Design a protein around this ligand. Structure first.
Ligand SMILES: CC(=O)N[C@@H]1[C@@H](O[C@@H]2O[C@H](C(=O)O)[C@@H](O[C@@H]3O[C@H](CO)[C@H](OS(=O)(=O)O)[C@H](O[C@@H]4OC(C(=O)O)=C[C@H](O)[C@H]4O)[C@H]3NC(C)=O)[C@H](O)[C@H]2O)[C@@H](OS(=O)(=O)O)[C@@H](CO)O[C@H]1O
Ligand code: NA
Length: 754
């Protein structure tokens, strides 16, 4: 493994991270990318510490604070990037070069060297600095001496002697997993190019293989496409994207070389592009329900993370078979074209710009997001789509935490796992336009909530506690899904609620039952809490309009429906009062993240809710949401028994969709909902077509070995599709007995003939 091969690998990495070989002359998007590169470099140079015998490299960054030590090194690597990028203002500038070299030398002497013990966050010492210092060594290889390489390699190896492990010796070292394994292996691989160390490079490449093996618990990719990091938090949209980015860059770097990734099981990672990442991408944004504590970050948004996933997918597509390459390019062209709110080229790097330009040059057409249901039972998440909308549900259970907070981020997010209903629509900024700085964290859309105030960081950091609930889970057949959550409230209030969602191709029916608490406070259920930006969007009712005055809550008259201009319709399925509030809310990103700006953002909201009162005894609700419905269509929702409630109590919750001729149900106890029965916890959807009955079924606790259904629509004597055993009960009804051992909440599809 020789000098020529190492020089070629370093030159490829510099090509990848600068775009120096792919800048198109006179292209306006390249010029904008260089301007952004120039402005960041100039900002850093303006902050250089010029003092004799300096103790920092930048006047605004202390080397005694571990996060500011990381930013010292990322500024130095950005400066080296600019120095290596043709047409940048500092390209080849010897004075700027000397300042980068002196910054790397003094940061090494003063702080980050092979005699230093870690202080503070392990991630700073083992991932933040190594990736940036390794990039700077490679960018500056022709300029650093052999003695400088020896010093900086020794510092990296001191903190990361083995990238299969993490934490300083005093803590006890553990296996690194998922995004952390990828980031540690990346820093050692790039450091092995600077120091020409084939032994360390080979071991780091071999370390990538663990991250795409299927798991059934802990962190990683599950067979249903879920991705978990930190044991208990759904995490495809942030840690999953870190993993996707780092593998795309390392696979591209090493391809065709002596160090190429050759493990055939990497097919599992490729299958995750459509199995894991695509269903939670919504018009260019990663869904908030799968990005954990990053919702609290003003400048690490669902669109920032979706744009990074698009860049990685485009980079990986270059190596794939023709059909797969074109499918991934079509998905990306669609997420790019539909996103007029944060266009991907605004503030894009040179490499990102080149990949987006290459995609446009293929002429590959944009692929629409498919209607229908994508369920992720391993991480208590579901996605549902129809024309103009995508619903993301955020549940929690004895497997999945209420929320992750940590490092001063998302400390207020404790209700985000209480049955949230995110309706994404053509309002592309709904959840991005200062929503997380201004929203009422006690009235998030869809939740049931005990109004007892909870402290920041209630239930602990890092998802350490989970609700001891009965089950959360889901199933779907064709166009209809059934989703259930036994909500146990955070903060030991004793709040309990049975929340179910029955989701068709257009409307979502929301049923709640068995609601009580021990706290003595009122309990609410939030029909919506919806960002109006600076708008005065009209709320129309049967009688006229409601909540025309900001700050004055009103109760809906008798028609039972309300339409929100720019959104769609809501309607009540019982005779409970609906409270409607137009409100103006203010807050700063500093109020939800220690790193957030102090700038105050002010936003208008529409807030619709039911009040279960103090001391509810088996409190309940029933309502529906029709995203995109007109006033006329909203007025008609409650006519003709289109959405026919069957049962809504502590035993079962069920609705029939008249038009779709399909019935959906959740079961909490053994019992009957209309003419369907279950022997235990179940999600069921069924539809008869003439002499054939179709069923989807899940066993949502993930722990029962069997489940028996009492079948609707008459008697059934054979099985056409699927597995299960037919039987007959005491009352002459047909039964279906399923073996559910080890099914992990997955759906079984069955078809019976009369
Ligand atoms: C303090 C401590 O010991 N806590 C551990 C906890 O470790 C923490 O969790 C993560 C981790 O990597 O596991 C680490 O998260 C990453 O933090 C950095 C800054 O430190 C970035 O956050 S940001 O600066 O606020 O944006 C990073 O964000 C991502 O960065 C990048 C990138 O650099 O490539 C790209 C993405 O766009 C962006 O989202 C952030 N990662 C994410 C995805 O948020 C913390 O720094 C680290 O303290 C866990 O440790 S673990 O190893 O067991 O996982 C935790 C597990 O329960 O245990 C705590 O004790
Ligand atoms: Na956790």
């Amino acid at each position: 493994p020789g000098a020529a091969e190492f020089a070629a690998l370093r030159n490829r990495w510099v090509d990848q991270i600068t775009g120096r070989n792919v800048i198109q002359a006179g292209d306006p998007d390249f010029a904008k990318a260089i301007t952004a590169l120039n402005n960041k470099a100039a900002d850093s140079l303006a902050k250089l510490d010029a003092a004799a015998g300096r103790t920092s490299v930048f006047t605004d960054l202390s080397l005694a604070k571990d996060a500011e030590m990381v930013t010292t090194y990322t500024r130095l690597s950005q400066l080296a990037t600019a120095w290596a990028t043709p047409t940048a203002a500092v390209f080849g500038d010897a004075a700027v070069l000397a300042a980068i070299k002196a910054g790397l030398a003094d940061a090494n002497t003063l702080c980050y060297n092979d005699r230093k013990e870690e202080v503070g966050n392990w991630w700073s010492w083992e991932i933040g600095v190594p990736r940036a210092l390794a990039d700077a060594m490679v960018l500056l290889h022709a300029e650093l001496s052999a003695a400088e390489r020896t010093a900086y390699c020794a510092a990296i190896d001191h903190f990361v002697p083995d990238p299969w492990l993490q934490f300083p010796p005093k803590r006890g070292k553990i296996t690194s997993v998922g995004a952390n394994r990828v980031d540690l292996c990346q820093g050692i691989i790039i450091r092995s190019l600077a120091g020409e160390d084939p032994t360390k490079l080979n071991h780091a490449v071999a370390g990538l293989s663990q991250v795409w093996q299927y798991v059934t618990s802990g962190d990683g990719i599950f067979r249903d496409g879920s991705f978990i990091q930190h044991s208990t938090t759904p995490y495809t949209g942030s840690y999953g994207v870190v993993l996707l980015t780092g593998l795309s860059k390392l696979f591209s770097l090493l391809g065709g070389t002596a160090f190429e990734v050759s493990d055939p099981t990497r097919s599992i990672f490729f299958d995750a592009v459509e199995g894991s990442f695509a269903p939670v991408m919504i018009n260019g944004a990663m869904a908030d329900a799968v990005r954990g504590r990053s919702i609290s970050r003003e400048a690490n948004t669902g669109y920032d993370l979706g744009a990074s996933a698009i860049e990685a997918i485009l980079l990986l597509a270059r190596a794939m078979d023709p059909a797969t390459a074109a499918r991934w390019r079509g998905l990306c062209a669609g997420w790019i074209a539909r996103d007029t709110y944060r266009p991907i080229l605004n503030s894009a790097s040179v490499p990102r710009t080149a990949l987006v330009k290459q995609l446009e040059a293929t002429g590959v057409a944009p692929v629409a997001e498919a209607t229908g249901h994508k369920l992720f039972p391993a991480m208590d998440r579901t996605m549902h789509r129809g024309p103009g909308w995508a619903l993301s549900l955020a549940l929690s259970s004895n497997r999945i935490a209420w929320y992750e907070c940590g490092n001063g981020e998302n400390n207020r997010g404790y209700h985000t796992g209480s049955g949230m209903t995110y309706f994404y629509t053509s309002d592309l900024g709904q959840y991005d336009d200062a929503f997380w700085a201004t929203a009422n964290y006690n009235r998030l859309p869809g939740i049931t909530v005990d109004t007892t105030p909870l402290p920041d960081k209630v239930e602990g950091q890092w998802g350490a506690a989970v609700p001891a609930d009965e089950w959360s889970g889901a199933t779907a057949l064709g166009e209809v899904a059934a989703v259930g959550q036994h909500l146990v409230g955070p903060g030991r209030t004793g709040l309990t609620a049975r929340k179910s969602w029955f989701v068709s191709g257009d409307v979502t029916v929301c049923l709640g039952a068995d609601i009580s608490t021990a706290s003595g406070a009122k309990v609410e259920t939030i029909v919506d809490h919806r960002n109006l930006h600076q708008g005065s969007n009209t709320l129309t009712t049967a009688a006229g309009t409601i909540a025309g005055t900001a700050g004055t809550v009103e109760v809906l008259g008798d028609g039972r429906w309300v339409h929100l201009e720019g959104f769609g319709g809501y309607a009540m399925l019982d005779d409970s009062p609906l409270h409607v509030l137009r409100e103006t809310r203010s807050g700063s990103w500093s109020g939800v993240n220690i790193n957030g700006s102090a700038t105050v953002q002010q936003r208008n909201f529409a807030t619709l809710y039911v009040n279960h009162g103090v001391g509810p005894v088996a409190g309940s609700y029933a309502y529906m949401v029709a995203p995109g419905a007109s006033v006329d269509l909203t007025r008609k929702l409650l006519e003709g028994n289109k959405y026919s409630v069957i049962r809504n109590d502590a035993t079962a919750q069920s609705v029939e969709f008249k038009t779709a001729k399909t019935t959906a149900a959740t079961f909490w106890k053994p019992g009957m909902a209309g003419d369907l029965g279950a022997s235990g916890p179940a999600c069921v959807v069924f539809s008869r077509h003439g002499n054939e009955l179709s069923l989807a079924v899940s066993e949502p606790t993930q722990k029962a070995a069997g489940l028996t259904l009492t079948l609707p629509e008459g008697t059934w004597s054979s099985v056409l599709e699927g597995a299960g055993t037919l039987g007959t009960d005491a009352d002459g009804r047909s039964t279906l007995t399923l073996d559910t051992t080890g099914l992990s909440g997955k759906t079984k599809l069955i078809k019976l003939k009369r």
